[PDB]
Ligand binder design. Structure first.
Ligand SMILES: CC(C)N1CCC(C(=O)Nc2c(OCCCO[C@@H]3O[C@H](CO)[C@@H](O)[C@H](O)[C@H]3O)cccc2OCc2cc(-c3ccc(Cl)s3)on2)CC1
Lengths: 247, 10, 26
């Protein structure tokens, strides 16, 4: 995260570190959506251009963390993957269309003060909150510019689709949205490398709950003027989500 | 870099 | 069920330091 702040303790209790065994390193962000299910970007597990193809046994999930590098004894939970599932129409050749994967954990995790699932959106919450100018929040442990001691946080506005498209020569799909401040605006900030697969969340003003509207997908640089971060449209893929979950 | 994690998870 | 309600904020009715920036944008 570039131009973010240090997270508060328990601010993002659904935040999940994707952790590589050897080398023992940060791969991606991710999110906890129930006791046995973790949501991430497909490109965290499978991205042939940067030589990436992970199997279950290469990877761990670390839940409940705040420190990037410490082993947070009595606080974090490190879990094992039973199964990875990449969306079958995931487009890694072109534009990262349908950049989404689910990970089933080998056993359920116990919730705690630091470990709690985020909500997935329903149609109406999507239709009501996913509007240009409305802000969501991104968190993670990725680089501070194009590395943090602790989880970082930034609040970013959703950007009008035409602007997203005119910022880039990539072909945007309806399964993605973009966010970020415009050049003229007073504020800046962005995700960066190591934040990807993490959650873009919004807080409903109707029921006071946090909804995962986005997954951190890609950007051209980190926090460049006239560029924006691209996010997987979670609601749009939500039928795939509850397919694999009830099956 | 990263503090080592309990080898029970490895 | 209990999703999106954080043990140290909403479940104790405490606000975080920047959530108001979000709500004001809506
Ligand atoms: C569409 C898809 C196929 N590719 C998109 C670009 C991407 C890449 O190489 N990004 C990139 C990068 O982009 C390189 C592309 C070439 O840069 C060019 O820079 C030019 C400057 O003149 C621009 O005009 C031009 O539009 C632009 O493409 C440069 C450095 C690190 C980079 O990754 C860091 C990163 C960012 C992030 C995120 C930031 C915000 C998120 Cl939300 S997620 O995570 N990791 C590779 C995948």
């Amino acid at each position: 995260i570039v131009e973010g702040s240090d997270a508060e303790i328990g601010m993002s209790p659904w935040q999940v570190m994707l952790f590589r065994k050897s080398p023992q390193e940060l791969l991606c962000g991710a999110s906890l959506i129930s006791d046995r299910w973790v949501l991430t970007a497909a490109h965290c597990l499978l991205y042939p251009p940067w030589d990436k193809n992970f199997t279950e046994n290469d990877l761990l999930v670390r839940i409940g963390k705040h420190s990037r590098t410490r082993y947070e004894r009595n606080i974090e939970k490190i879990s094992m993957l039973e199964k990875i599932y990449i969306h079958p129409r995931y487009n890694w050749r072109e534009n990262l269309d349908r950049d989404i994967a689910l990970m089933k954990l080998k056993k359920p995790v116990a919730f705690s003060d630091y470990i709690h699932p985020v909500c997935l959106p329903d149609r109406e919450t999507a239709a009501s909150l996913l509007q240009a100018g409305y802000k969501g929040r991104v968190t993670g442990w990725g680089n501070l510019k194009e590395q943090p001691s602790v989880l970082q946080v930034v609040n970013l506005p959703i950007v009008e689709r035409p602007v997203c498209k005119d910022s880039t020569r990539i072909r945007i799909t309806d399964n993605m949205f973009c966010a970020g401040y415009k050049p003229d605006e007073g504020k800046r900030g962005d995700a960066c490398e190591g934040d990807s697969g993490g959650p873009f969340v919004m807080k409903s003003p109707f029921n006071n709950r946090w909804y995962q509207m986005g997954i951190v997908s890609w950007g051209e640089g980190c926090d460049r003027d006239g560029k924006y971060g691209f996010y997987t449209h979670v609601f749009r893929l939500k039928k795939w989500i509850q397919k694999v979950i009830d099956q | 870099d990263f503090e080592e994690i309990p080898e029970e998870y490895l | 069920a209990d999703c999106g309600l954080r043990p140290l904020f909403e479940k104790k009715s405490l606000e975080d330091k920047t959530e108001r920036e979000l709500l004001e944008s809506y």
